[PDB]
mmCIF file of C-alpha atoms in Angstrom:
data_model
loop_
_atom_site.group_PDB
_atom_site.id
_atom_site.type_symbol
_atom_site.label_atom_id
_atom_site.label_comp_id
_atom_site.label_asym_id
_atom_site.label_seq_id
_atom_site.Cartn_x
_atom_site.Cartn_y
_atom_site.Cartn_z
ATOM 1 C CA UNK F 1 38.258 -60.067 125.890
ATOM 2 C CA UNK F 2 34.582 -59.343 125.565
ATOM 3 C CA UNK F 3 33.116 -56.832 123.126
ATOM 4 C CA UNK F 4 29.635 -56.460 124.634
ATOM 5 C CA UNK F 5 30.447 -53.505 126.907
ATOM 6 C CA UNK F 6 28.987 -50.808 124.631
ATOM 7 C CA UNK F 7 27.371 -47.549 125.730
ATOM 8 C CA UNK F 8 24.696 -48.218 128.354
ATOM 9 C CA UNK F 9 25.708 -51.370 130.247
ATOM 10 C CA UNK F 10 22.318 -51.828 131.974
ATOM 11 C CA UNK F 11 19.862 -54.179 130.158
ATOM 12 C CA UNK F 12 17.115 -51.522 129.918
ATOM 13 C CA UNK F 13 15.765 -53.062 126.668
ATOM 14 C CA UNK F 14 14.252 -56.233 128.212
ATOM 15 C CA UNK F 15 13.304 -54.470 131.446
ATOM 16 C CA UNK F 16 11.403 -51.694 129.533
ATOM 17 C CA UNK F 17 9.842 -54.433 127.338
ATOM 18 C CA UNK F 18 8.303 -55.752 130.589
ATOM 19 C CA UNK F 19 7.387 -52.361 132.179
ATOM 20 C CA UNK F 20 5.562 -51.325 128.953
ATOM 21 C CA UNK F 21 3.302 -54.365 129.640
ATOM 22 C CA UNK F 22 3.227 -53.947 133.465
ATOM 23 C CA UNK F 23 1.722 -50.452 133.236
ATOM 24 C CA UNK F 24 0.313 -50.956 129.699
ATOM 25 C CA UNK F 25 2.104 -47.779 128.466
ATOM 26 C CA UNK F 26 2.685 -46.339 124.987
ATOM 27 C CA UNK F 27 5.557 -48.009 122.977
ATOM 28 C CA UNK F 28 7.465 -44.772 122.272
ATOM 29 C CA UNK F 29 9.060 -45.412 125.741
ATOM 30 C CA UNK F 30 11.615 -47.817 124.175
ATOM 31 C CA UNK F 31 13.203 -44.738 122.636
ATOM 32 C CA UNK F 32 11.617 -42.014 124.843
ATOM 33 C CA UNK F 33 13.280 -43.357 128.034
ATOM 34 C CA UNK F 34 16.816 -43.201 126.562
ATOM 35 C CA UNK F 35 15.823 -40.029 124.671
ATOM 36 C CA UNK F 36 15.189 -38.307 128.060
ATOM 37 C CA UNK F 37 18.990 -37.946 128.301
ATOM 38 C CA UNK F 38 19.519 -36.381 124.823
ATOM 39 C CA UNK F 39 20.636 -32.742 124.564
ATOM 40 C CA UNK F 40 18.127 -30.137 123.359
ATOM 41 C CA UNK F 41 15.279 -32.580 124.099
ATOM 42 C CA UNK F 42 12.210 -31.788 126.262
ATOM 43 C CA UNK F 43 10.781 -35.151 127.493
ATOM 44 C CA UNK F 44 8.107 -33.649 129.726
ATOM 45 C CA UNK F 45 5.546 -36.449 129.364
ATOM 46 C CA UNK F 46 4.126 -38.934 131.886
ATOM 47 C CA UNK F 47 5.296 -42.280 130.492
ATOM 48 C CA UNK F 48 9.042 -41.526 130.805
ATOM 49 C CA UNK F 49 8.300 -40.850 134.494
ATOM 50 C CA UNK F 50 6.420 -44.162 134.514
ATOM 51 C CA UNK F 51 9.376 -45.930 132.830
ATOM 52 C CA UNK F 52 11.670 -44.615 135.622
ATOM 53 C CA UNK F 53 9.136 -45.358 138.469
ATOM 54 C CA UNK F 54 8.544 -48.929 137.184
ATOM 55 C CA UNK F 55 12.219 -49.566 136.317
ATOM 56 C CA UNK F 56 13.206 -48.553 139.851
ATOM 57 C CA UNK F 57 12.055 -52.041 140.969
ATOM 58 C CA UNK F 58 13.461 -53.882 137.890
ATOM 59 C CA UNK F 59 17.161 -53.697 138.906
ATOM 60 C CA UNK F 60 17.096 -57.544 138.725
ATOM 61 C CA UNK F 61 16.443 -57.156 134.962
ATOM 62 C CA UNK F 62 19.095 -54.480 134.329
ATOM 63 C CA UNK F 63 21.738 -56.212 136.397
ATOM 64 C CA UNK F 64 22.922 -59.590 135.048
ATOM 65 C CA UNK F 65 25.485 -60.358 137.757
ATOM 66 C CA UNK F 66 23.067 -59.482 140.585
ATOM 67 C CA UNK F 67 25.264 -56.610 142.046
ATOM 68 C CA UNK F 68 22.694 -53.809 141.875
ATOM 69 C CA UNK F 69 20.043 -54.000 144.624
ATOM 70 C CA UNK F 70 17.220 -51.730 145.823
ATOM 71 C CA UNK F 71 19.020 -49.178 148.025
ATOM 72 C CA UNK F 72 22.425 -50.890 147.414
ATOM 73 C CA UNK F 73 24.314 -49.515 144.366
ATOM 74 C CA UNK F 74 27.629 -48.582 146.123
ATOM 75 C CA UNK F 75 29.619 -51.482 144.659
ATOM 76 C CA UNK F 76 27.951 -51.009 141.227
ATOM 77 C CA UNK F 77 28.906 -47.286 141.371
ATOM 78 C CA UNK F 78 32.530 -48.378 142.021
ATOM 79 C CA UNK F 79 32.352 -50.630 138.892
ATOM 80 C CA UNK F 80 32.023 -47.302 137.014
ATOM 81 C CA UNK F 81 34.504 -45.358 139.214
ATOM 82 C CA UNK F 82 31.918 -43.515 141.375
ATOM 83 C CA UNK F 83 33.203 -43.867 144.977
ATOM 84 C CA UNK F 84 31.221 -43.698 148.252
ATOM 85 C CA UNK F 85 31.195 -39.914 148.425
ATOM 86 C CA UNK F 86 30.243 -39.676 144.708
ATOM 87 C CA UNK F 87 27.292 -42.049 145.351
ATOM 88 C CA UNK F 88 26.351 -40.155 148.567
ATOM 89 C CA UNK F 89 26.319 -36.888 146.554
ATOM 90 C CA UNK F 90 23.816 -38.359 144.061
ATOM 91 C CA UNK F 91 21.762 -39.934 146.901
ATOM 92 C CA UNK F 92 21.516 -36.591 148.793
ATOM 93 C CA UNK F 93 20.367 -35.194 145.435
ATOM 94 C CA UNK F 94 17.667 -37.947 144.895
ATOM 95 C CA UNK F 95 16.150 -37.347 148.330
ATOM 96 C CA UNK F 96 16.793 -33.591 147.791
ATOM 97 C CA UNK F 97 14.899 -33.625 144.481
ATOM 98 C CA UNK F 98 11.900 -35.272 146.131
ATOM 99 C CA UNK F 99 11.721 -31.923 148.043
ATOM 100 C CA UNK F 100 11.880 -29.269 145.314
ATOM 101 C CA UNK F 101 9.511 -31.317 143.111
ATOM 102 C CA UNK F 102 5.886 -30.721 144.277
ATOM 103 C CA UNK F 103 4.393 -34.048 145.490
ATOM 104 C CA UNK F 104 2.359 -34.747 142.382
ATOM 105 C CA UNK F 105 -0.991 -36.555 142.305
ATOM 106 C CA UNK F 106 0.650 -38.757 139.595
ATOM 107 C CA UNK F 107 3.641 -40.845 140.785
ATOM 108 C CA UNK F 108 4.980 -40.995 137.215
ATOM 109 C CA UNK F 109 4.955 -37.214 136.771
ATOM 110 C CA UNK F 110 6.392 -36.690 140.277
ATOM 111 C CA UNK F 111 9.166 -39.240 139.508
ATOM 112 C CA UNK F 112 10.080 -37.470 136.224
ATOM 113 C CA UNK F 113 10.163 -34.205 138.232
ATOM 114 C CA UNK F 114 12.644 -35.796 140.703
ATOM 115 C CA UNK F 115 14.690 -37.156 137.712
ATOM 116 C CA UNK F 116 14.619 -33.657 136.072
ATOM 117 C CA UNK F 117 15.930 -32.051 139.269
ATOM 118 C CA UNK F 118 18.644 -34.757 139.641
ATOM 119 C CA UNK F 119 20.342 -33.985 136.283
ATOM 120 C CA UNK F 120 20.418 -30.252 137.134
ATOM 121 C CA UNK F 121 22.234 -30.960 140.478
ATOM 122 C CA UNK F 122 24.817 -33.077 138.555
ATOM 123 C CA UNK F 123 25.323 -29.776 136.587
ATOM 124 C CA UNK F 124 26.214 -28.060 139.950
ATOM 125 C CA UNK F 125 28.685 -30.828 140.886
ATOM 126 C CA UNK F 126 32.301 -30.693 139.714
ATOM 127 C CA UNK F 127 32.104 -34.249 138.262
ATOM 128 C CA UNK F 128 29.762 -36.267 135.998
ATOM 129 C CA UNK F 129 28.651 -39.892 136.757
ATOM 130 C CA UNK F 130 28.244 -42.335 133.932
ATOM 131 C CA UNK F 131 24.491 -42.452 133.319
ATOM 132 C CA UNK F 132 24.513 -46.152 134.245
ATOM 133 C CA UNK F 133 25.461 -44.889 137.748
ATOM 134 C CA UNK F 134 23.152 -41.808 137.943
ATOM 135 C CA UNK F 135 20.144 -43.558 136.366
ATOM 136 C CA UNK F 136 21.081 -46.820 138.241
ATOM 137 C CA UNK F 137 21.077 -45.043 141.659
ATOM 138 C CA UNK F 138 17.823 -43.019 141.362
ATOM 139 C CA UNK F 139 16.257 -46.345 140.219
ATOM 140 C CA UNK F 140 17.727 -48.120 143.277
ATOM 141 C CA UNK F 141 15.974 -45.408 145.411
ATOM 142 C CA UNK F 142 12.766 -43.812 144.044
#
């Protein structure tokens, strides 16, 4: 067996530890990014949008086996039991959430808008991706 398959499979730690230097962000991000997901929590600040928008092109960091590619997460989704039509749902939502979100002068704050909208459409679906899928896919896209 292995016993390094804990909650959150994706190696966000190292990837974020680069993106914090790439954009020269705050350091709060190394919680604040994960914290975005927490219940009762309003993460309506720029740098979590930046973390997303910078991470979206760091799949090569998250993904150790080199499965997850920019605009190709279908197989990765199936590693977590999200089939074609489950991925397509989330993908219609990503490109759907670009719409409802006003095209912000700040790509970070736009991107957090899109990733706010996404979660709320998952709440209209009848199922619930693992976050490694949902987060993994909007990163493969945005």
